[PDB]
Design a binder for these strands. Sequence first.
DNA 1: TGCTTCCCGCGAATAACG
DNA 2: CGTTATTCGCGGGAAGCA
Length: 121
Amino acid sequence: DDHYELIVDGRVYYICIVCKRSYVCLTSLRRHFNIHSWEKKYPCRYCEKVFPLAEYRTKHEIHHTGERRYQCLACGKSFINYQFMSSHIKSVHSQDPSGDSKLYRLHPCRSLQIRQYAYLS
DNA sequence: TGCTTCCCGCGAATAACG
DNA sequence: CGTTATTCGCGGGAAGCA
Ligand SMILES: [Cl-]
Ligand SMILES: [Zn+2]
Ligand SMILES: [Zn+2]
Ligand SMILES: [Zn+2]
């Protein structure tokens, strides 16, 4: 088909037949394989760009609307994505958002319609 | 070398299935 | 519907880029 399996320590891995990338979950291998097959297109609704993963397109479109969902809870500045927020917090506040404390807020996406995680409230 | 986008395990929201 | 299968958002590290 589109993958084969490898088993080490009863550990199951799924191997893409084209690039031979490894995945713990088959849904991940299938998500990745569209990159090769393009059986599904994810077109930007704001311009003409096409993406092989839905999440790639979503990040892209958020870039179109200018919405800033990531907010530093130390000083209030907002950022378009995780990386800007994290960079800001590390440089300006000398802290790490992947540590123990909660240092940023991710607001619900409001500038466009995507699935909404209830915990973002 | 610092933005910028990619990657993939994990699991919540939702669609497809009786 | 209730249930299972599927989709895809998210973190945060990695890979790409000029
Ligand atoms: Cl905003
Ligand atoms: Zn592959
Ligand atoms: Zn676009
Ligand atoms: Zn701040």
